Design an enzyme around this catalytic site. Structure first.
Site, PDB file in Angstrom:
ATOM      1  N   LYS A   1      11.191   3.989   0.376  1.00 15.24           N
ATOM      2  CA  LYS A   1      11.533   4.520  -0.939  1.00 15.24           C
ATOM      3  C   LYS A   1      10.995   5.924  -1.206  1.00 15.24           C
ATOM      4  O   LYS A   1       9.860   6.250  -0.866  1.00 15.24           O
ATOM      5  CB  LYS A   1      11.045   3.560  -2.033  1.00 15.24           C
ATOM      6  CG  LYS A   1      11.974   2.360  -2.245  1.00 15.24           C
ATOM      7  CD  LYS A   1      11.520   1.445  -3.382  1.00 15.24           C
ATOM      8  CE  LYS A   1      10.744   0.232  -2.878  1.00 15.24           C
ATOM      9  NZ  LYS A   1       9.360   0.565  -2.438  1.00 15.24           N
TER      10      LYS A   1
ATOM     11  N   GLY B   1      -4.406   4.135   1.910  1.00 17.08           N
ATOM     12  CA  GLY B   1      -4.077   4.562   0.563  1.00 17.08           C
ATOM     13  C   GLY B   1      -4.867   5.788   0.158  1.00 17.08           C
ATOM     14  O   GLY B   1      -4.374   6.647  -0.575  1.00 17.08           O
TER      15      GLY B   1
ATOM     16  N   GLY C   1       0.002   3.229   8.216  1.00 18.39           N
ATOM     17  CA  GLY C   1       0.140   2.133   9.156  1.00 18.39           C
ATOM     18  C   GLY C   1       1.290   2.250  10.138  1.00 18.39           C
ATOM     19  O   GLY C   1       1.108   2.038  11.336  1.00 18.39           O
TER      20      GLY C   1
ATOM     21  N   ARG D   1     -13.633  -1.554  13.111  1.00 15.57           N
ATOM     22  CA  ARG D   1     -14.360  -0.883  12.044  1.00 15.57           C
ATOM     23  C   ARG D   1     -15.853  -0.808  12.346  1.00 15.57           C
ATOM     24  O   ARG D   1     -16.526   0.129  11.922  1.00 15.57           O
ATOM     25  CB  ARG D   1     -14.108  -1.586  10.710  1.00 15.57           C
ATOM     26  CG  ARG D   1     -12.758  -1.223  10.116  1.00 15.57           C
ATOM     27  CD  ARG D   1     -12.380  -2.077   8.920  1.00 15.57           C
ATOM     28  NE  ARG D   1     -11.211  -1.525   8.236  1.00 15.57           N
ATOM     29  CZ  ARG D   1     -10.525  -2.157   7.290  1.00 15.57           C
ATOM     30  NH1 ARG D   1     -10.880  -3.374   6.909  1.00 15.57           N
ATOM     31  NH2 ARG D   1      -9.479  -1.572   6.727  1.00 15.57           N
TER      32      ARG D   1
END
Length: 396
Positions: free
Chosen positions: A194, A375, A352, A37
């Site tokens: 899911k 996200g 990921g 990062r």
């Protein structure tokens, strides 16, 4: 193209520049364990310096409690990193809310924004104190753009000038190219355990895509939606009817063959362990028994997906088509990764599992853009309005 101001287009001579970065690096016992990062944000800081700007960098680190600073979440080791990496003394300031001293050509690092009361709630007063420090606010942390916080949203609202950094700008441009009138055919790959978890993702892409390739638990649910038996495969019975409706709205190609394992060889106490030791079997999609578990797509389906991906001119890649961590159930994902990489289509990847697949099969070079947004990446694909991007649009 979207309309927001960009740091690289601005003259910053003698200007106070406050840059929001993602310097949330993993730390063990005061030592940085991964500087990925940091290496990513460095060109932004250097570009600001090469423009004669007085640079202030601030960031979040870990999950501390506001108003209760602990050394384990201090940006002190990051300041030491920036000092060695930039060749100048990068000072760490712990009390900067009422003013911080910085001159042209130097870099100061402000302490963890998570230490500040009102940060998570986008407190107006805190945001104004942030804004008062700068002439230009630069948002360069996309992974946090999906939350409305004092250092990511409010500061952009009250700063004299608010702009996007090179990292943020590159991310939005690449995402726009795939989400806003992409070159057809447009194909997305959406996988996960899911359907429910990526339901908004699926519905959003259903309107944008020409074809929707699904993988994993999601694919099994769509497979059941087509009237096939999935045996003991992982799928969501409660969302079969929803998957069914989706498959009617958009073309969802279905596997012709699959890789299965027999459930008598699966111990969920150690799933991955019992999966590597299990005996993989290639079977026709209709030859799946009650005790079968779909764990990868078959050889024929992989070729079929490849042809689709070779024909498309825009690829959004969000997931593998099998449990590729174990090699005998990884041929599907290996073939898929090669198909995406060698397609002349503009390809964008995120999530990921996707990145893990890219690293394992070494196709990083050949991917158009690799997002680390997590996200935040998904919420953009969902068509949602990311607060940090929206305010930049208002100030530009």
């Amino acid at each position: 193209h979207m309309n927001f101001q960009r740091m690289t287009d601005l003259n910053l001579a003698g200007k106070r520049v406050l840059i929001r970065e993602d310097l949330n690096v993993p730390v063990k016992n005061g030592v940085i364990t991964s500087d990925a990062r940091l290496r990513a944000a460095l060109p932004t800081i250097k570009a600001a310096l090469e423009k004669g700007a007085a640079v202030m960098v601030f960031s979040h680190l870990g999950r501390p409690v506001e108003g209760e600073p602990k050394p384990e979440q201090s940006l002190a080791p990051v300041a030491a990193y920036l000092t060695e990496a930039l060749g100048q003394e990068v000072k760490l300031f712990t009390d900067y809310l009422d003013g911080v001293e910085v001159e042209a050509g130097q870099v100061v690092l402000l302490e963890n924004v998570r230490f500040n009361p009102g940060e998570k709630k986008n407190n107006p007063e805190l945001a104004q104190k942030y804004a008062a420090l700068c002439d230009v606010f630069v948002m360069d942390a996309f992974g946090t753009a999906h939350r409305a916080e004092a250092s990511t949203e409010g500061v952009a609202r009250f700063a004299p000038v608010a702009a996007a950094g090179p990292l943020l700008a590159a991310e939005l441009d690449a995402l726009g190219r795939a989400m806003q009138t992409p070159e057809k055919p447009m194909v997305a790959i959406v996988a996960g355990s899911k359907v429910s978890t990526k339901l908004d993702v699926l519905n959003s892409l259903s309107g944008i895509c020409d074809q929707l390739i699904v993988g994993g638990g999601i694919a099994n649910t769509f497979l059941a939606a087509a009237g096939y038996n999935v045996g003991k495969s992982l799928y969501e019975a409660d969302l079969v009817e929803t998957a069914k409706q989706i498959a009617a709205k958009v073309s969802v190609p279905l596997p012709t063959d699959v890789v299965v394992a027999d459930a008598s060889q699966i111990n969920f106490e150690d799933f991955l362990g019992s999966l590597a030791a299990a005996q993989a079997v290639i079977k026709k999609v209709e030859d799946v028994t009650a005790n079968d578990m779909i764990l990868d797509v078959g050889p024929e389906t992989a070729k079929a997906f490849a042809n689709i991906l070779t024909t498309s001119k825009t690829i959004l890649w969000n997931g593998p088509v099998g449990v590729f961590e174990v090699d005998q159930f990884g041929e599907g994902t290996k073939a898929l990764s090669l198909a995406v990489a060698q397609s002349d289509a503009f390809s964008i990847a995120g999530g990921g599992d996707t990145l893990a697949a890219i690293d394992k099969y070494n196709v990083a070079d050949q991917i158009g853009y690799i997002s680390t947004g997590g996200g935040a990446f998904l919420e953009f694909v969902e068509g949602k309005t990311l607060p940090a991007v929206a305010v930049l649009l208002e100030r530009a």
